[PDB]
Amino acid sequence: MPFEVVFDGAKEFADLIATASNLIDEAAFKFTEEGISMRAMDPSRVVLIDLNLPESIFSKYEVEEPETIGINMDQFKKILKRGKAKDTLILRKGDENFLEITFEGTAKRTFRLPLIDVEELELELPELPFTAKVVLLGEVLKEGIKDASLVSDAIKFIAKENEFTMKAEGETNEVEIRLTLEDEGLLDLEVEEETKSAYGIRYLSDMVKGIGKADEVILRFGNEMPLQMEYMIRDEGRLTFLLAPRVEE
Template identity: 40%
Template sequence: MGNSELWKNCIGPISKLIEEAAFTFTPEGVRMKAMDPSRVALVNFELSADGFDSYDIEGKRILGMNLEEMSKFFSRAKKSDELIFSFQEGENRLVLTFKGTSIRKFTLPLIEIEEKELPEPELEFTASAKVLAGMIKDGLKDASLVTDKVRFELLNEYFLMTTESDTGSAEMKLPVGSEGLQELKVDEAARAMYNIGYLDDIINVASSNDTIEIHLGTDLPLQLDFSLAGGKGRLRFLLAPRIEAE
C-alpha cells in the first residue's frame, strides 16, 4: 500500500513529459528512469520499500506503463485514499485500488518496454540552493509574460530568475536570508537559460510550500531534486539548457 497523493503528484507532471516508461520493482523498492522524446529532460524516480505502508515483491519485476493513462486514473484519487498496487499475472494488467470512504479499482494494461540504461551525465555543478517551490512558480509566471525562456542564476548573495525580449523584461530575486531561499552554496557563480514550458511541468510536482533543491553550472543542464515520503524517495529532473546566442 502506498500514498495515493504522492503518486498522483508525481505521475501527473511526469506524464506531461514522458508518455511511456518502465518501472522496476524489486524487494528494495521501485525505480524509473526515462527521457522525453526530444531528449531535453531526464526523469529519475526512486521510492524505497520503506516508503510504502506495506510492500511485498519477490525478485525483480519490470512493468511498462502508459503514463498518460495512468495519470487519468490517479486524477480520480482523493487526498486521504490509500493506494494499493497489485498485478494480474494472467491478464498482464496493473490494478490500482483507491481505498477511502469507498473502494474503487482501475486496471491498466501493461505494455512491452525495454528497460534502457540511461546513465546520468557527470556534471560539475558550481552552485546549489534550496528554494520554496512557490517562489519558482511565481518567477515562472512572471517570466512567461515576456517570453518562453528564463535564466536561472546563483550568486553569492542571491538566487535570480530573469528574462527579457522585445516586449519587456521580468526579474525575481531571492536574497540570502529571505524566507523563500532556505540554503545557498556558491563555489562559482552560475547561470543558464531554460525552457519555461518544461519547467512548468516539472515544478507542478511540488506544492508551493515544498522545498526544491537546485544544482546549477553555467550553461549546464539544470538538476532539480524533490524529496518524497519524508526522504524515503526522490524525484530528480535534469533539464537541458537553451544556449544563449552571443
C-alpha cells in the same frame, strides 16, 4: 513479478505520475527489493526525469522478485482522475498480465488493466562538475516562473557568492528578482563562482505547477552546463529533473 503495495492516500504519487505522463508517455517502473525506480528520457533527447522510492514510503509493501514492468501513461492518467484524498490505494500484480488497483471505503472499487512492456534503453548519466548548488522553496520559484512565463520563455538564473538573481529579458518587457540569505524565498546557498544561464520554461512551468507550494527544491547548475532540479518525497524518496540550457544570448 507478483507484488502488492498498499498505502492509505497517494494523491502526491498520483500528481507525480500525472506530471511524468505530461512529460512523456513511454515509461517503465522497475520494481526491486529496495522499492520502485523509473527513468524517463525525452523524445527530443533534451530532458531526463528520474525517480526512486524505497520501501519506507507506503504502508504495506510485499514484493516477490525484482523485475521491470510497464504501465501506459494514458491508461494511468485515466485512472488517477478518481483518486480520493482519503482512499486506500492497493496495487496488486500476479504472474499474468493483470494489474489490479483497489480502493477500500464506502464502496469497494477494483479496476483490472492489462500490462504492456516498455523497452526504453537505460544508461547511467556520467558525472559532471556542478560548481553551483542552491536550495530554495518551491512556491517562490513557481510564482516567479508563472509571472515570467507570459513575457518570454528564456529565463536567466545568475548565481554569485551569497547572491542570486532570476531575470526575464526581452524587447518590450523586463522582470527581475533578487535573492539573498535574509530574503523570504532562499533556504541555503552553496555557490562557488559567478554562473549565469538562460533556460526555457515550458517544461519548467509545467513541472513546477505539478509540484505543490510547500515543497522545497534543490538546484544544481554551473556556467552553461545543464541544470538539475531535485527534491525529496516524504524524506525517503528522491526525484530529479535534468535539462540543458540554450546557446543563444
